[PDB]
Structures are given as structure tokens and as C-alpha cells.
A paper describes a structure:
The arenavirus surface glycoprotein complex (GPC) is the target of neutralizing antibodies. GPC comprises three functional subunits: the stable signal peptide (SSP), GP1, and GP2.9 GP1 binds cellular receptor(s), and GP2 contains a transmembrane domain (TM) and mediates membrane fusion. During attachment of New World arenaviruses to their cellular receptor transferrin receptor 1 (TfR1),10–12 a GP1 pocket accepts a tyrosine (Tyr211TfR1) that is conserved in all TfR1 orthologs that can support the entry of these viruses. We determined X-ray crystal structures of JUNV GP1 with the weakly cross-reactive antibody Fab and of MACV GP1 with the potently cross-neutralizing antibody Fab.
CR1-07, however, bound to JUNV and MACV GP1 equivalently in an ELISA and potently cross-neutralized MACV pseudotype. Its affinity for MACV GP1 as measured by SPR was 16 nM. CR1-07 reduced plaques for infectious JUNV and MACV. We therefore determined a high-resolution (2.0 Å) structure of the unliganded CR1-07 Fab and used that structure, along with MACV GP1, as search models for molecular replacement. For the MACV complex, our model is further supported by the high-resolution structure of the unliganded CR1-07 Fab we used for molecular replacement.
Residue numbers in the entry:
A (entry chain L): 1 to 221
B (entry chain H): 2 to 138, 145 to 227
Write the structure that this text describes.
Amino acid sequence: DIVMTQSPESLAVSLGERATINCKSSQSVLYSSRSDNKDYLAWYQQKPGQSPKLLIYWASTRESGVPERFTGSGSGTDFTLSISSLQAEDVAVYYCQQYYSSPPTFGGGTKVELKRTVAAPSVFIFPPSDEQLKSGTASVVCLLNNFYPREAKVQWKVDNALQSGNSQESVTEQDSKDSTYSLSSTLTLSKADYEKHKVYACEVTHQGLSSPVTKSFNRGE
Amino acid sequence: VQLVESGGGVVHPGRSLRLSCAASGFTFGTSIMHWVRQAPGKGMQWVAQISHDESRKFYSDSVKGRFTVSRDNSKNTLFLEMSSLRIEDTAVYYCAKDLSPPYSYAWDIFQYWGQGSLVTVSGASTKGPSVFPLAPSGTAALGCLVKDYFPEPVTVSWNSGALTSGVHTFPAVLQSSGLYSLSSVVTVPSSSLGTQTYICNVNHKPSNTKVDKRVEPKSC
């Protein structure tokens, strides 16, 4: 019945800098016995798609092989996970967990992001394929590749007319090597409508672009 | 140390499903094992605990009476029998080893985890994807659009796994149709398009779909 609460939901810090993750238990997880007092709390690291890994437990004790830059501290009701010098490979979601009472419960997680230099996106546009147009539907895709930060505005235009509601976005997780993002934007259209307009354009706005970038094509050429 | 969960997929509400977890690298027979799950965009939730000899079993009140944890120590395999499944049971299910030493009660410290197995519970029809090329027209971008499939997930490789640099498979997006859509892209030297063949290998296991679409460049 113990509720764990983590703060903040996400943080971004530069290479070599300190990341701080706070965790609060609804009830004290400090257990008293004949031996020393121990805080029944553990920390875990989870990269997308990969097996979670035990980092710390008893609040402060490092698991074998965990680098010393990971430091667990706190007592009773307040706890902190400290990353002395963040590395790209450190990008992950971190969760705390109490095992003082049953059932064991976890925090909501904190996303740790690496704040790297600004990188402008490489923009590409893809018309619907002849295969799909034969199938009766039409999808126009716009790719923003290897950019940072994540924030970016994609606006579709059909014959210079701005689009809204007919597109959907998807963003990759921060890369493990260059710590960049990639974004897809899909304009879904009906075949009949697609054939009535000529120029399709994807205009991108980003912190790394001095001015909006445009990638477009003409349907029939 | 390896924990590999298998089984899992889509099931209609009310039906059952059995997960398995093959273990190696530790004395499985003498260690306490757990099941922990993670619902979409939420935190971990402990599900079940089982002792070395199965004499002591424990379940989360959220699954009590519906799930059964068992194990076969001769084959170093952990089992989770899930019955009367509900929409809220949709999650990636992890197999985990407890840090407690042999013959001691559980520490509830999850020393080792598996990579997890996705369990989907929906009364929605399974459907495979349609794979269309994102044709390229000193670096050129190729891709494949994987459209109108359900339930998740699909996995995309390029050139039977030989091409992995510059690949970005985007997370699925649910359309107003209720079907998922996904894209996978790859950047490649522009000078290889006329000679090198690029084939996206899409795999959607729920529907038993496995497509190899060759992406041809546009030349003008």
C-alpha cells in the first residue's frame, strides 16, 4: 500500500554534468531490527526495449558493476539518485522501488535526457507510392533526421494551403551514439483528393534552422 | 545470466494465455522468481512471486484469483498462467530473479530481469500490415511504410539484418481507424542507389505476416 512518487518526470543535463532524481515514499521504508537500520529502497535503470537493470539497493549500496557515478542517498521517506557525470549511455528511465512492505511498489519513473549541442534536421519528403495509390489511399511522409532538441514544428501545405488535423507525428527515442532525434510526419489523404492537387510541401521549423526549411514535390512529375 | 520470456500476444477479453521464461546462468532451482508487468506509459507493477519449490506463492490483489504462477525446475522455466484476462491487463510482462539467497524468504529486490513479452487484451480483429516503399529520389534516405495493422508490434530490419547503421524505425501511431501505422527509414550513400539493393523486412507475428519489400530508387 506504499505509494512511490518520483520528481521530476524528465530532465535534460549536459555531458559531464550532474543529474538528480528524487523519490518519495508515502510511508517510511526504514526497518529496525537487531542489526543496523536499513532503508528498503532500490533503484533501477531501463533503456527502451531492454532488460531493466538493478542499480542500487538498501538506498545507497551499489550493485556489482554499477559505476561509482551512480549515487543513492536519503533515508526513511525521501531519497535521491545522483548521476555524478552523465554519459550518453546514461540516457534512460530511472525508477525507485520500496520493498519494506508487501506488495513491492515502484515509482512512476524519471526520463533522463542528454542535453547536447543543437543539431538542425535533415528534411526529406516522400510521395505516395504507385503501389499505395493503386490500393485506393495516399500517404505523404516527411522525415526530420538527426536533430536536437526534440522540439520542432512541421506544417503541411497542399497547393500553398495549410493543413491541420490530417497529419500524425512520431518521434524516435534519443539516439544511443549521437543523442539525436528523428521525426516522421505523415499526411494521410484519399487517392481522389491527392490527384486533384499538385504541389505538396513539408515546412520545418527548428532551433537549428536560421529560417524555415521546405521540402516539396509536384504530384505529376 | 539470461532471462528470456516467450509466449504472449493478443487475446480476447475473458480468454487465457500462458507466458514462459527460460532461465540460464544461475541456480534457478533454488532461487525465488517474480513476474512484473508494465502497462503502456505507466510504471512497473509487481504481479506474482514463487518460491524454489512452489510451496509459497504470492500475487498482486489486481490479479489474485485469475493468474497462477508455476515453474519447472528440471527445465529452468518459469510460468504465468493468465485467465479471465481484461483490457487493463495489457502490458509487457517481465520475468525477474529475486536477490534473496537460497532458502531465504523473498527480498523483493529484482536482481535480474528479462526483456519482457507484450500481452494485448482486446476484442478487436487482428490484421496484418500493407508494406509500401518510401522510394529515394551525398546521403539519400530510403524507407518503408507499414500501414493498417493491429495489434502491435511489427519489427523492421533492412537487408536481412546486414544494414543497421542509419536505421530509424519510428514508434507506431494509432490512426482514427483503430489500426496502427509505422515507418522505418535508413540513410545511405547517394552513390549506392543504382547498384545496392535495399529491402525492408517487416514482421508482424500476431498476423503471421512476414514481408520483404524491395525499395527501388526514382531516377529522372
